Structure formats: C-alpha cells, structure tokens
Amino acid sequence: GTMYYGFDIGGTKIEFGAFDADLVRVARERVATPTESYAAFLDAIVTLVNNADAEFGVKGTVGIGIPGIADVETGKLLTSNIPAAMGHTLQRDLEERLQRPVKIENDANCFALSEAWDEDLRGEPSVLGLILGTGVGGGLIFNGKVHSGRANIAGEIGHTRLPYDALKLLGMENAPIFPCGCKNSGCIDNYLSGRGFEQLYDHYFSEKLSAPEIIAHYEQGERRAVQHVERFMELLAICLANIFTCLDPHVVVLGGGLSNFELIYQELPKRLPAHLLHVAKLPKIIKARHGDAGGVRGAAFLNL
Amino acid sequence: GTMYYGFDIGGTKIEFGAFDADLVRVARERVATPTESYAAFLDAIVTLVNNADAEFGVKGTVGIGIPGIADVETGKLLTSNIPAAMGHTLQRDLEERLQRPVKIENDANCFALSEAWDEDLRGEPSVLGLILGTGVGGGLIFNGKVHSGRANIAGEIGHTRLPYDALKLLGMENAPIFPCGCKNSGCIDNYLSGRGFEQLYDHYFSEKLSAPEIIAHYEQGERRAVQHVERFMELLAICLANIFTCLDPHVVVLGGGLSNFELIYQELPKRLPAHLLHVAKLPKIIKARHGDAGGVRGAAFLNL
Ligand SMILES: CC(=O)N[C@@H]1[C@@H](O)[C@H](O)[C@@H](CO)O[C@@H]1O
Ligand SMILES: CC(=O)N[C@@H]1[C@@H](O)[C@H](O)[C@@H](CO)O[C@@H]1O
Ligand SMILES: [Cl-]
Ligand SMILES: [Cl-]
Ligand SMILES: [K+]
Ligand SMILES: [K+]
Ligand SMILES: [Zn+2]
Ligand SMILES: [Zn+2]
Ligand SMILES: [Zn+2]
Ligand SMILES: [Zn+2]
C-alpha cells in the first residue's frame, strides 16, 4: 500500500505524521527543534522516517513543510525561524540519505493545500490560506493548484510594507515602524502576527503583555485592551482589503494562533467593505477546518 | 468557418478587430467613444458587428474588453472612464441584439491573455500583464488561465494604497496624497499612471507639463525632469516589488502609454532587487509584444 509522510518543522518543535491510502492519520510524533547544530536537525528528521518505515513495514512518499523558502536555484533555505537549518540544501541531504525523492514546501503553502483539499473547497477557482501566528504567511491556490512563484516567494504577504491607510490609522509620522527579520522595515509580518499584536499593545500602553493576556483583558472589557483590539481589527481589515483588491480570492481560510481569536470572524466582514472597492464582494472567510494540522497534512499531500 | 471578433472600448475611442481561424487580423476599425448617451454607445458596437458580419459572410464569436468591472451578479458595469456605459447590463443588451453568446472581460485581463498566448509565454506557470497608462491595471494569468477573482476584481493593483517605503521616498507626512476615482485616497493608480507621473511632476515643480514633454526634457538632461524621473523609477520599483513579494510572477509584461518609456526596462531590473526579499529572483520583464493591440486580441481570444 501507499503511505504518505509529512513533516511540519517549526521554530520550537518538529511534528511528524503518516497517512495511508485512505488518508487516515496512523502516526503523530513531536520532537523538539534541534538548534545550534545542523547535524542534529538532520538527524531528528531521518530518525522519525526510519522508526516509521519499520513500524508499518514500508518506505512512503516524503513531504516537508518549513517556514521560509528553498532557493529555487541552489536548494538552500532562508529561514530565520530555524537557526540550525539556514543556508543548507535540506532537500538534497534527505534525498540521498533516504534513498527516495523528497518534496519541500513553505509552511503557508502546505496549510493552504491542506485546507483546499477539503471537499468543500476543492472546486473553488481560488483559495487563499492565511497564517496569522509567529509571522504572517499566505498560500495561493488557483483552480486547485498551489502557485509557488518564480522564486518560491508567492504569498509572502508578510513581507509587504504597511499601506498608507494602515499608517494613517497608526498616526502617520508617529506610527511605530517595526524592523523585520527580512531586514526591511514596516513589513506587516511585524504588525498582524501574534508578536505584532503584542508589540502594538506595548507601543501604545508601555506594558509587556502576551497576546493571550491582552485578549483575556479584552474579554473582561478593560479599557486599554478594548482600544487595542478595535485598532487591531481595523488594521487587519485595512491590510487584508489591500491584499484582496489585488488577489480577489474566492475563499480565505485563516490559521495560526490568532486564527483562534473568534472576534476576527465577526469583525472582518463588518470592517472590510469600507476599504474594498464599492463593487467588491466579500470572500468566504473561514477558520481552518483541520486545526493546527495543516502543515503536516499539506506536507504529506505534496505527494498525492 | 471560424471568425473571432474583439472590441477594446476605451475612454476616447472604441477599437474593433476580426481574426480568422489562423488568427490573422482581417479587420481593424476605430470609432470614437460615444459618451453623450448610452443609446449611442450601444449603437457604435452593434454597427461594427453587423458591417463585419456582412463583409466576411459570417457572424463569429464576440469578445469585449472594457476598463472596470462587470458585476459578477447583476451584469452592470463600473467604469468611471466611460460615462455612457456605467450602470448598464452591457452583456445582456448585446447577447440579444446579435443572437449569440457574448463574453466580456476587463481590459487588463484581455491584455494579459493576449500577451500570454505568445508561443514564448505559453507554458510559463504565471504571467502578470501590467498596464501603465490612463490608470494602472493588472491581469493575472496562472498556468495559461485568467484569474478573474471572486467579484471580477483580481489584478486591481491600481486601487491598492502606496506602501510605507513609497511614502517614505515621497516625504512621509509631506508626501502628496492624491484622491482616487474609487473614492479612496493614495491609491497607486494616481501615481504610477501617465496622469500620476504628471501630477507628481507638478507637485514638486509647480508646472503643468504632459508626460511626453517631461520625458523630452529628461532626454535633454534638464534638472527638474532628471530629478522627477529618478524619483518616479524608484517609486515604480518600490510599488512593484511590494506587489511581486505577494504574487511572485514568472513573467511581467508592460503595456499602456508609459510602457513606451524605454528607460523603464533598464531601471526596473536595477532597482527592484533592493526592495525584493534577499532570496527573490527577478521576473522576466518585457515590453508588450503586440504593441497596443492586446485589448482587441485578448477580447477576441476569450472565445478561443
Ligand atoms: C521569509 C520568511 O521568513 N517568511 C515567513 C513565511 O515564509 C511564513 O509562511 C510566515 C508564516 O509562518 O512567516 C514568515 O512571514
Ligand atoms: C476600478 C477601475 O476603474 N480600475 C481600472 C482598472 O479596471 C483598469 O484595468 C486599469 C488600467 O486600464 O485602470 C483602472 O485602474
Ligand atoms: Cl526647483
Ligand atoms: Cl533614472
Ligand atoms: K507562501
Ligand atoms: K484586472
Ligand atoms: Zn520583511
Ligand atoms: Zn493581566
Ligand atoms: Zn482607488
Ligand atoms: Zn518644454
């Protein structure tokens, strides 16, 4: 039988998953992300493939989802989330030290592919998978196929700069201009992420709270948190309206930590129309149907 | 046999074209854009279909390209460029008068489809057709098919707001914030168009010159025009790099009046790398291969 393996490699932990011909998840393991050695990164992955090869008596197709980009020419990763990985040719290493073809894909692309494979979305002309978590990431699907881009950068909406209307909301020349991991400044990755949410609160209120704690205070109706959340929802709507005016997606699926903030699903539909073109219609906006598993599933499904 | 008609309806004139089984253009007419009634708009179009039906002894497939958007639900056109058309159910009114299926498409979408049908681009995974003219328009092609969007708004990059790095180039709180036809403000349609090029020159130098005259003065090395052009090319690179970080197109084809400013093909490749991600690669950037005929050809090729 056909087995499909998937890996979701994150900053803090690696997640492994195995799916059978019916796509039933028959294995799930989480090891910590080995950092400060790349010998140790590599090992963790080939470890899990091997264990699983034995345990099911086969060697199945392999897919990897990682944050950042495999250079379309050299094969080397830009991934400032994973110190241990950066600069290496991850694909090639695994491809021989495993005796079979390895597919590699950006994490947001895996997420979008996982969500779009749902029966409900499979025939939509376009799907945008948006991760609002550690960073801001996008996966573009057109007629069921990932658009990965000339250099594997398609959907890197997190490294676009705040638009004018967002800057105006945040005070124009007084707006906080956050530095970015890509080395540019004012990229939305640092505003609409969970970390961006926290940095914004701290900028206006001079207190170093976590997103969950701000949100808890919001649910208690506390004044600063209510003001922060109003500002954040308007900022989110402005930024997304700019993106939707370019992409006009049929369905937008949200993932990552902030996708669990339920107010988003109420506030986005109310706030987007003001920033969209007058003749625009709202996309269908939905919370991820597979929770946190999109990375693993999409990585495995690269070899469907 | 098989004839294909195409119409390119602009602000100033309507252009008609007819193509045979081999795609040889056997007819070309240009009538003025009737704007004092919609009775007169409609007429101009049905006129030319009829003439051509007779003269070739057949009535073939019909495609129309127009600036703006036919409502994906009702059929009604938003085009503030064409007063006479706005609000009406253009498709239906023509689908009966001629007794056959009539396809309608945005002008930038037709342009991109016309360029993408070139043998050179036919198997490119993506093509962005970009019009820099009266306004700024984009046509998105993925694996050879137009992405028209949830509400026919895909590629409306002209109605995205200037990014932070563009505002910084133009002086931040001192940057000119131009009003837009869509009723938002700071849309790039009013900066990167031929009219935007003119308004920026006038903002900094208080003289009302046309784009051609500014460009002529640039070619003479004159101080103000050289300063303006340097600023404009940097603004163009910044805005496009933001868009390319989202879309990552394999090929970018430029059309419209400003696409004849040859300096763009030299300066864009030099200036884009600074504003793209470090791992990004330049798209193939090319001047339209069919000159000013993309509207007509793409409109005709809707039925291909
Ligand atoms: C180059 C880079 O680090 N960009 C990443 C992006 O690839 C990822 O999809 C997103 C969400 O995880 O976070 C970041 O914005
Ligand atoms: C809403 C609107 O009028 N947008 C148009 C766009 O449709 C067109 O493609 C572009 C280029 O011609 O100019 C404008 O930006
Ligand atoms: Cl001066
Ligand atoms: Cl220059
Ligand atoms: K992506
Ligand atoms: K368009
Ligand atoms: Zn960035
Ligand atoms: Zn507290
Ligand atoms: Zn606008
Ligand atoms: Zn002069």
CA B99 and chain centroid, separation? 29
Of A145, A154, A248, Cβ closest to residue B247: A154
Helix axis angle for A211-219 and A223-247, nearest 10°, is 110
Angle at A187 (CA atoms; ends A186, A191), nearest 5 degrees:
85
Q: How was this structure determined?
A: X-ray
- What's the rounded Cα separation, in Å, for the pair B221 and B202? 18
Structural domains in chain B, sorted by start: 4-111+293-303 (3.30.420.40), 123-287 (3.30.420.40)
Q: Is B95 in contact with B101 (CB distance < 8 Å)?
A: yes
Q: Residue B35, annotated ligand binder?
A: no
A137 Cβ closer than 6 Å to some ligand 1 atom: yes
Chain A environment of B278 (Cβ under 8 Å): 78, 182-183
Helix axis angle for A263-271 and A223-247, nearest 10°, is 60
Q: Is A35 in contact with A83 (CB distance < 8 Å)?
A: yes
For residue B296, with 0-12 CB atoms within 10 Å meaning exposed, 13-18 middle and 19 or more buried, which class applies? buried
Q: How far apart are the CA of B269 and the centre of ligand 6, in A?
A: 24
Angle at A159 (CA atoms; ends A156, A162), nearest 5 degrees:
125
Q: Which residue type, as a one-letter code, is found at position A146?
A: V
- What's the rounded Cα separation, in Å, for the pair B56 and B129? 32
Q: How far apart are the CA of A207 and the centre of ligand 8, in A?
A: 10
- What's the rounded Cα separation, in Å, for the pair B280 and A148? 12
Q: Which residue type, as a one-letter code, is found at position B169?
A: L
Q: How close, in Å, is residue A220 to chain B by CA atoms?
A: 35
Residue B31, phi then psi, degrees to nearest 5: -105, 155
Tokens of B247: 């879309």
Q: Which residues pair with B129 in a beta bridge?
A: B139, B253
Give Cα separations from A162 to A140, B167, B189 (angstroms). Answer: 20, 10, 17
Q: How close, in Å, is residue B236 to chain A by CA atoms?
A: 14
Q: For chain B, give the DSSP string.
A: ---EEEEEE-SSEEEEEEE-TT--EEEEEEEE---S-HHHHHHHHHHHHHHHHHHTT---EEEEEESSEE-TTT--EE-TT-TTTTTS-HHHHHHHHTTS-EEEEEHHHHHHHHHHTSGGGTT-SEEEEEEESSSEEEEEEETTEE---TTS-TT-GGGSBPBHHHHHHTTGGGS---B-TTS-BSBGGGTSSHHHHHHHHHHHH-----HHHHHHHHHTT-HHHHHHHHHHHHHHHHHHHHHHHHH--SEEEEESGGGG-THHHHHHHHHGGGTS-TT--PPEEEE-TTTT-HHHHHHHGGG-
- What's the rounded Cα separation, in Å, for the pair A75 and A90? 7
Q: For tokens 């506030």, name the residue.
A: A267
